């Protein structure tokens, strides 16, 4: 059973701006997702300074990107802290975010969309490039859940009986728009990582499917 | 809940021979799995000659190999016909197989283990290289199930709430033995495919994880 939740009204309004935007530097979505992944990795590592047990659900600390061209999907996985059900509900849409209005007011004054991570709302940049997202997450303190949104006014949260087990962490599953299929390509991906994600403390893995010739 | 089933006695005896064998040409396990994958692909394609609907759960016809080095696992996936629960139970261990005794009698006369596919029992060759297998399968006619064995006298079958959805087909998940970790390596894999699987009608995909430098 899927519980449904309403987005706070300014978040809806923010996704609607970003979804319907001509902006020409959309690659920054990947800088934001990598940077969030790194934040989550920092938190599990930090937590484990005084609780080493927390690392054992998933000893390896990594960021992994998996294009799925046949489904038009790009997945960004991390083994960071993960989010519980209550965390997905509170933090991904139901409660007002501090920088949402301020970011939109800056945008309409001329600010580059790039500044979105500085306003602390950079997760919503994934709608530049995607018209649907699943956030699949496994916190040490809860079962695996799927949060899903298509940028309308509500999102669902659902106990995960459908995807592979994460030992610990999060998978951002993006349903790319038809004009944004360039982020399915290996060359394009490495290039965006080189430009925007030079200083990442964690290995960044790219999963590539080759045909044997 | 996992139902448990008993292997027919000669199948147990066959796995026990293969598990405990010095034989020096174990790579043939991959020839057998690829060839089984191709058999399953033939059957779905054939079925769909008079029922094109059957293809739509998974339009693409492929064999995909995914080493998972960190788990010491090798997965062989196909989008073939898949097997229902009853098929996994009947065909993977509970009923006597025609070539089981005859293959063992040949083995003890001097036959190469390679002849195993000729006796129609080549699936059990995966125990040359693995001490545990999951067969995860999705037939158009049933839900996704996991069959599991560790070469003892019984196996389990379990409704799958734990792995990614197959649209249609089968994943052979092999828990490699510590001395057989060479089949985790890309170079080794392509080499075994070149030698034994030259004439396969279907694309063979290798999934490779690279670190971005
Ligand atoms: C205020 C600083 C504290 N951290 C941050 C917060 C506030 C809280 C949400 C923190 C979270 O609370 C449970 C968690 O601690 C984890 C670690 C979540 C992640 C960082 C993210 O994913 C993973 N797991 O890869 C991400 O969703 C996938 C979250 C997106 C959230 C919003 C909306 C966002 O756009 N930007 C935010 C960033 C960037 C933050 O760093 C942000 O809001
Ligand atoms: C007698 C000729 C008919 N086909 C074969 C049979 C008899 C039946 C089992 C057929 C099956 O019935 C439901 C199915 O029709 C599908 C197609 C199953 C696959 C071919 C296999 O996997 C996929 N899906 O990749 C494989 O398990 C993973 C099966 C292993 C079975 C045994 C034990 C074996 O060692 N060798 C066999 C081979 C090779 C056969 O071709 C075999 O026994
Ligand atoms: Cl806030
Ligand atoms: Cl038979």
Curated annotation (Swiss-Prot), chains A, B:
Induction: Expressed constitutively and induced by high temperatures dependent on transcription factor HSF1. According to PubMed:2674684, it is constitutively expressed at low levels, however, due to the specificity of the antibody, this result is unsure. Changing residue 40 to V: Causes a 98% reduction in ATPase activity and a reduced client protein activation activity, leading to growth defect at high temperatures. ATP binds at residues 32, 36, 78, 83, 91, 97-99, 118-123, 170. Changing residue 100 to I: Causes a 90% reduction in ATPase activity and a reduced client protein activation activity, leading to growth defect at high temperatures. It is found in: Cytoplasm. Changing residue 82 to D: Abolishes ATPase activity. Belongs to the heat shock protein 90 family. The TPR repeat-binding motif mediates interaction with TPR repeat-containing proteins like the co-chaperones AHA1, CDC37, CNS1, CPR6, CPR7, HCH1, SBA1, SSE1 and STI1. CNS1, CPR6, CPR7 and STI1. Present with 444943 molecules/cell in log phase SD medium. Homodimer. Interacts with the co-chaperones AHA1, CDC37, CNS1, CPR6, CPR7, HCH1, SBA1, SSE1 and STI1. CNS1, CPR6, CPR7 and STI1. Interacts directly with the substrates GCN2, HAP1 and STE11. Molecular chaperone that promotes the maturation, structural maintenance and proper regulation of specific target proteins involved in cell cycle control and signal transduction. Undergoes a functional cycle that is linked to its ATPase activity. The nucleotide-free form of the dimer is found in an open conformation in which the N-termini are not dimerized and the complex is ready for client protein binding. This is ATP-dependent molecular chaperone HSP82. It comes from Saccharomyces cerevisiae (strain ATCC 204508 / S288c). The lineage of its organism: Eukaryota, Fungi, Dikarya, Ascomycota, Saccharomycotina. The gene is HSP82. The chain holds residues 2 to 214 of 709 of the full protein.
């Amino acid at each position: 059973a899927s519980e449904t939740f309403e987005f706070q009204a300014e978040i809806t309004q923010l996704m609607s701006l970003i979804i319907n935007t001509v902006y020409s530097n959309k690659e920054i979505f990947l800088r934001e997702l990598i940077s969030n992944a790194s934040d989550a990795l920092d938190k599990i590592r930090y937590k484990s300074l005084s609780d080493p047990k927390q690392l054992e659900t998933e000893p390896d600390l990594f960021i992994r990107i998996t294009p799925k061209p046949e489904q038009k999907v790009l997945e960004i996985r991390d083994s960071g802290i993960g989010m519980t059900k209550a965390e997905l509900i509170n933090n991904l849409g139901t409660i007002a975010k501090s920088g949402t209005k301020a970011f939109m007011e800056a945008l309409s004054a001329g600010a580059d969309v790039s500044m979105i991570g500085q306003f602390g709302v950079g997760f919503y940049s994934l709608f530049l490039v995607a018209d649907r997202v699943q956030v699949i997450s496994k916190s040490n303190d809860d079962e695996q859940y799927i949060w899903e949104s298509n940028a309308g006014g509500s999102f669902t949260v659902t106990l995960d009986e459908v995807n592979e087990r994460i030992g610990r962490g999060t998978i951002l599953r993006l349903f790319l728009k038809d004009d944004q299929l360039e982020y399915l390509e290996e060359k394009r991906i490495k290039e965006v990582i080189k430009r925007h994600s030079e200083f990442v403390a964690y290995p960044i893995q790219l999963v590539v499917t080759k045909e044997v010739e």
